[model samples]
Target: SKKHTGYVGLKNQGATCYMNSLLQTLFFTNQLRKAVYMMPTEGDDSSKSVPLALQRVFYELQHSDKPVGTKKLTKSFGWETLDSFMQHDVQELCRVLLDNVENKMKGTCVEGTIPKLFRGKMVSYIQCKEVDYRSDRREDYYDIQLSIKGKKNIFESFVDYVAVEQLDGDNKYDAGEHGLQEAEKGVKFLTLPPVLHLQLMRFMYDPQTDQNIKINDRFEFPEQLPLDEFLQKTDPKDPANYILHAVLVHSGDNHGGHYVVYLNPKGDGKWCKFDDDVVSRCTKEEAIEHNYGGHCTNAYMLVYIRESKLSEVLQAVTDHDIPQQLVERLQEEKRIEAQKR
Candidate 1:
């Protein structure tokens, strides 16, 4: 009953490593795992139920001593064999899965769980310099999408994310009755999520080359990311300090790439690389510095758990934590397959 670091990996289907990487990260997210385990999937069909399929995947990933396969999970998405062989965007997959899970959890005990875990608020506003005119609006986001171009590291990218842009000269703001007025326009964080997903803009269209290219510039990220300075009216006890949870990496060019994830499952600094069916321990530097973009293998999506919620988010998942009916239903489904074989 030996497992790699007390954890099993996911089996990738041709180009399905991207999904495997993202799914592994989500499984390690104890909050989401508990919610999935509690989902009322007893009356649902695996073929059409996204949340049930995800619940089963997480269940196998937790209890199985061997690598878990995602065929059923992909099938739940109505994706075919050809789709499994085609690499899809990880960010897009994250959105789809979360959206489906949130939808499925509605009216259940876990209603609004996903938003509570990852949703955050920011204010985008424009302020006129010469008049008493200011306009602002707030928006919620699950991930703080940041640009990596011309930025050396995560901090620089964050600085760019909230950097105030001057609306002056030809770009002056049309302040209605005030006519054209020089102003300042930018976004500021109002609240941060318990779990933060930072999607680095690593792939972009280069008009010069007339093609999309991956940015391989040296960009570094830290083990501890302090975002106190980025938020406004933040709670003192629960400041926006976060510890790195996972680094989802891409190891190839813009055309295509292999996906892997370096994760700290316990939020205790011990890192492990989840590369398809192989899972092994890794150094802190191997998880962070090695993925710092300069080469083809670079971090694409960074998952950070808020330090204040570290223990709460990584609480141990046990059989007792799982809903009993959900377990029986899944076991019944598997037992029928067993008898068929």
Candidate 2:
């Protein structure tokens, strides 16, 4: 029903599908794969190391054509932490995998590149219009989390910033003893990586049900997401859009469900549904149908790659040289940025 790259399936070892689906999705991320694959193999012992395990897993997932068991990575994950054997959170697994990469890449040349590929800097500021009680802070995040609670679109839910409360929210500034409006807020992007990871806020705690439930509300997203308008301090020419690359979907309640992925190997191309090891090619229209409403079928994770004709970051991963025009702009910007002394 769909076209797909030649990739193998992972054996469903108990409830490890959560991690299995995650590995499949990440393996298809060629840029990230190359960066991780390029890391030196001369680190700690092979079996116990996270970087080595990732390297090993990616190598197997690509080279092997049959469903393979992830014992190496699974045992590696169970080595140092209370990480479980049953179904677990993909985001939690991502935390550990990236942590291992950071820990092992210390003092390496590509240490800088891993963060450059996934990390983005966001600056959020909240200011009190009165007593100059303004506060601003900057934090770095690998994944952008957007809440779909009581919102229709990504932009609306993702405001430039939110109105905040410094003291009491029931007043206005310079008008009453306690201003109804406490602080006005704004948030914008500072720097973005070549690959962007977005987590749609679908899991929320429900006190009434006394458990965490999945949000099945229809949150709309475009095939190409524009970040040019979301940038706070940085602006550039064209190529400001982040094209949809992959989507991780859930199929049941938060407690019990299946994890499958819809991945577009190329940012602007066909999509494949990866359920464990069964790969079926899908159409752009069929894939976008995930946006249609259903129980637990909503998109949980979204991956996008910035649209660029010549990306230096991509140049390293693929077997191609950077184009001359993009190369010219790359170096010119480098020089201008350098002279900001």
Question: If candidate 2 were superposed on the true structure by all CA atoms, what would the RMSD be?
Answer: 10.9
1-341: candidate 1 lDDT, tens digit per residue: 22559889888665674688789989999989999887777678768888999988988888878888888888888656665434455777788899999987899988998999999999999999888799999999988778888887788888888898998777688989999999989989999899999888887779999867878887888999999888868787778889999999888885347888999999988889988878999899889999996678888889999988888888888878878788787788779989988
Clashing pairs in 2: 2-281, 3-281, 9-277, 160-187, 161-186, 171-179, 171-180, 171-181, 172-179, 172-180
TM-score for each candidate, following the candidate numbering: 0.93, 0.80
Query: Model 2 over residues 58-87: C-alpha lDDT tens digits?
Result: 665655567766777777767323336333
Q: What are the runs in model 2 whose C-alpha is more than 4 Å off?
A: 1-4, 79-88, 160-182, 309-341
Candidate 1 clashes: the total is: 0
Candidate 2 lDDT score at position 300: 77
**Model 2 vs. true fold: TM:** 0.80
TM-score of 1: 0.93
C-alpha lDDT of residue 328 in model 2? 43
